[PDB]
Amino acid sequence: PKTVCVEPGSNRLPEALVVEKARDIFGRPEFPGKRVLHNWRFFIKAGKAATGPPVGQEFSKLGLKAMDFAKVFNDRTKPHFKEDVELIVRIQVYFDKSYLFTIEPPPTAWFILRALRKKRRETGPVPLRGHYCALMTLEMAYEIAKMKPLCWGRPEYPLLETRVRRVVGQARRMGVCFIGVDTPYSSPVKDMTEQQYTEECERYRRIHMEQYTTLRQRELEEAPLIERLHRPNMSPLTDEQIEEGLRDPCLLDTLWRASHPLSPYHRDLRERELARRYLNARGWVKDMTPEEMRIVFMNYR
Amino acid sequence: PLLFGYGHTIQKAVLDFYRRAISARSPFPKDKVFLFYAIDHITPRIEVTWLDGTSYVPPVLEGASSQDLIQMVMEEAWLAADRMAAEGRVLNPLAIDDYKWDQLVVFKKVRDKE
Amino acid sequence: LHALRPHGNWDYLPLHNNQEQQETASLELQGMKASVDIGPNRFDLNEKDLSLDEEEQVEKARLDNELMRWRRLQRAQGSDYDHWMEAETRRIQEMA
């Protein structure tokens, strides 16, 4: 009978304590910006304390010391971590044989296996086996995607409404069936009826769409200078954001990578110029909105 | 600080020049290389102050590369060192160093490749 | 060798577990290895940082001119009938 919180879409961010601990463990050390020699990713349990065979092989091939990495990992990950929990360690080794490693939460497959209590080789794709795996809902997927953001400095971005699409795609690739999709009906409510639930879903859907739109506009308008240089942008820049970008130390490396001709910044700029030329060449009038031109294309094939 | 909309070859060349100046041949080039941001839309520029206090400003025009800027700065550095030696200034000579050993590593790599 | 092995002093470093537990690991422990121990930190040192002498520049220019002449002569060496037919067929398949 007890409900945690009744609010139209307010259970988005995780608990304050776990978010603080995640900002502590999963952090972004200041990258120097030197030339990258190697990019490696491994899966290491935080509970155990030993030198892994693959990381030791990599460090021996590069001539480095694996004991230092093992010591720092076992001194930073052994406390405040469950027993036998995997973590994704991404190591970046530069041309000076200097390595910088970051720790990341387990992958979506590990999260799904832990949530479903299924062990290894207990799941398979439908085109390979012929039958669905254990049934799931698109709420455990939400709770899983809550703990896998792009950067732990801003857990709200990217949006859960976008993370859940990727996690449900991964679950479907694994071979799991769902109740909201791949099934015409969801789990029934005992206290409510079908028509009331349908109209409630409609109103909740429209208000959640309003919330998603306003949050997307907010996050797209307010973004740091690194995000402005690495991602597309069409909004003005504030003086406080300019000052924050100047305070940021990675601004130099970001600017150099963006000025590199094959950067995503240059890709997006060339795409936008090509779209401008496309409108100028296939536009009825001068002030042809891109949306109006898309409607023109849709109505005129 | 902000990046120009159209591809700014001048900005790219000046950033590459700063990168190569940080990676330049010196025991600690960080003590001599400094980077600054101009929010006043000041055109990207370089200012090299020699040991005597004289300043040189390599003009960064459209089409110039980081290699071109380095060539200009090094030719002017040779001329400035000649002026120092003629004035009577005692200059430290060029010799073998860890930068030269690393360049030897790169040279052996190139020789083994082709 | 077992005594003077690398990282052998770690067995004497930690005198007790109390100090090891009190020592809190910071994020700077991950970044303190991204810097060289003796020399300075440099961004990049590639083949494009190898200065060329006067004779090296002359040799490279002569090599580039020889490559240009070799390409010009290969354009006529491969000007055979069947080779031209194959080239134009591949060009048509690429453009279409």
Binding site: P32, P249, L251 | I39, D40, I42 | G31
Partner: peptide
């Protein structure tokens, strides 16, 4: 009458500590 009726700097960069601490 109708119109008035309608009318009425150079900053130092921050080097990352991995490059600057040495």
């Amino acid at each position: 009458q109708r119109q008035i009726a309608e009318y009425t700097q150079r900053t130092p960069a921050r080097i990352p500590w991995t490059m600057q601490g040495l």
